[PDB]
Scaffold this motif. Sequence first.
Motif, PDB file in Angstrom:
ATOM      1  N   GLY A  39     -14.099  70.035  21.094  1.00 47.94           N
ATOM      2  CA  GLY A  39     -12.994  69.136  21.394  1.00 47.94           C
ATOM      3  C   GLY A  39     -13.450  67.974  22.280  1.00 47.94           C
TER       4      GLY A  39
ATOM      5  N   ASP B 221      -0.818  59.352  22.543  1.00 48.66           N
ATOM      6  CA  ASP B 221      -1.962  59.835  21.784  1.00 48.66           C
ATOM      7  C   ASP B 221      -3.005  60.435  22.710  1.00 48.66           C
TER       8      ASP B 221
ATOM      9  N   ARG C  34      -5.249  67.877  17.172  1.00 45.56           N
ATOM     10  CA  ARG C  34      -5.230  67.311  18.526  1.00 45.56           C
ATOM     11  C   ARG C  34      -4.373  68.212  19.407  1.00 45.56           C
ATOM     12  N   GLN C  35      -4.546  68.076  20.716  1.00 46.78           N
ATOM     13  CA  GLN C  35      -3.788  68.879  21.643  1.00 46.78           C
ATOM     14  C   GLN C  35      -3.520  68.084  22.927  1.00 46.78           C
TER      15      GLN C  35
ATOM     16  N   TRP D 167      -8.915  67.598  11.250  1.00 52.77           N
ATOM     17  CA  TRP D 167      -8.792  67.194  12.640  1.00 52.77           C
ATOM     18  C   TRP D 167      -7.472  67.717  13.223  1.00 52.77           C
TER      19      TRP D 167
ATOM     20  N   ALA E 105      -4.958  63.053  24.320  1.00 51.24           N
ATOM     21  CA  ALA E 105      -5.080  64.445  23.952  1.00 51.24           C
ATOM     22  C   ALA E 105      -6.531  64.810  23.772  1.00 51.24           C
ATOM     23  N   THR E 106      -6.748  66.085  23.485  1.00 49.02           N
ATOM     24  CA  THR E 106      -8.077  66.577  23.172  1.00 49.02           C
ATOM     25  C   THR E 106      -8.039  66.640  21.643  1.00 49.02           C
ATOM     26  N   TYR E 107      -9.069  66.088  21.024  1.00 50.68           N
ATOM     27  CA  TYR E 107      -9.158  66.057  19.590  1.00 50.68           C
ATOM     28  C   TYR E 107     -10.254  67.018  19.164  1.00 50.68           C
TER      29      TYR E 107
END
Lengths: 214, 7, 229
Positions: free
Chosen positions: C125, C91, C40-41, C38, C93-95
């Motif tokens: 995502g 937290d 994230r962004q 995983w 974000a795009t995961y």
Amino acid sequence: ALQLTQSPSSLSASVGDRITITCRASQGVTSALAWYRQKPGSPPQLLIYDASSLESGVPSRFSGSGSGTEFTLTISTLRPEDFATYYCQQLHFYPHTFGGGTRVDVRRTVAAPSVFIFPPSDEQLKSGTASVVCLLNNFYPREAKVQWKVDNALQSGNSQESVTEQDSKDSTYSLSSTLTLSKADYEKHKVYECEVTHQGLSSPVTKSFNRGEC
Amino acid sequence: ELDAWAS
Amino acid sequence: RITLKESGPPLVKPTQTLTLTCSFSGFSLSDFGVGVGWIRQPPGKALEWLAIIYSDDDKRYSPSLNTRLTITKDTSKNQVVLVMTRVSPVDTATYFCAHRRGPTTLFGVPIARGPVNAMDVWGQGITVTISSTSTKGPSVFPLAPSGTAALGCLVKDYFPEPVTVSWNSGALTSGVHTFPAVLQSSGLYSLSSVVTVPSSSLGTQTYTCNVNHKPSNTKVDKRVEPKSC
């Protein structure tokens, strides 16, 4: 922990150019390094794995080399779809790590931003909050720095800014910064200034106004 | 530590 | 053909537990040396590695988030789940979940570890926003000033995204810049939309920003003009 530094963070280029991007690890990661290209609104796409292997289905203009602590990705002949953000990833040590990315955008002539400052509306002031916004319109390159000043005090931690994606017509960027204060604090000061630093300005341009001055 | 496939 | 896809709640509140599912096909998690990780962004930021899980059930986590993360696989449903506890605004974000290749084998013998050095296929995502805020329409305020002149509208304090902004019911497009919204510490979004016009037409042409925030049924048309009547 281990660090991956990409260079340069930002890079200007035109269709047809040959570009190279570097990634340096604070500790040797052997050849366990991969490169990805990410287009806005999409997930990263694997370009090179294991430092130099060309991922299947990836165009031949891409290649990568290096081992240990120095790595470079090069695009022999840049095409329109290569304008995007690139990342390197190390997979030799846990946790795996990504670099800070390097943005590749369409080059054009340097252009200083046209700056405008906007005081809070009396409509907003009646609700108890004051938003002061600064606009930096159509500038290039992307890097710009906004500094808010109130009665000569440098402001910190009470502004937020956003940048538009590169304009597909003139290749420039625009930036909006909002300084937010409560009505009470706003009223207890007089000179609101937006100072702007940019490669296109020989010196910082400052736009301001005096509150209540009418 | 080292990755699963390291060494 | 390998494909992965993330599912989960788009909105979650602080202190709560976030459970994200990666459903995949084209590969088995019980296949040798294969892994699913995983990443994230956060908006506008760099990619950040979160965790990875392998076929033999070995798990590894980001040291920074270790205590709030759990990752597990459900081999029979072809899924990998990531549970993040006590979430907070940071937290948001795009995961993304991604596949990690195992070593190349020949008649059951691994002969090349080169292909394991990358996450070769990624999901699209899933965007996750962390705020305690409830649905709320924006407050629109004018932006003036004013040969190039600038004017605009400040679309403040709404939730959640998105909001649409046009000028003069869609007739004005040249010189328009609608900036991406920023999530304020309050948990509400805020954005500006401005337009640059010849300092002449202000006395003649009128400028109205049309704001629409479907989530809360809020539509506003705000005419902006150089102050002082």
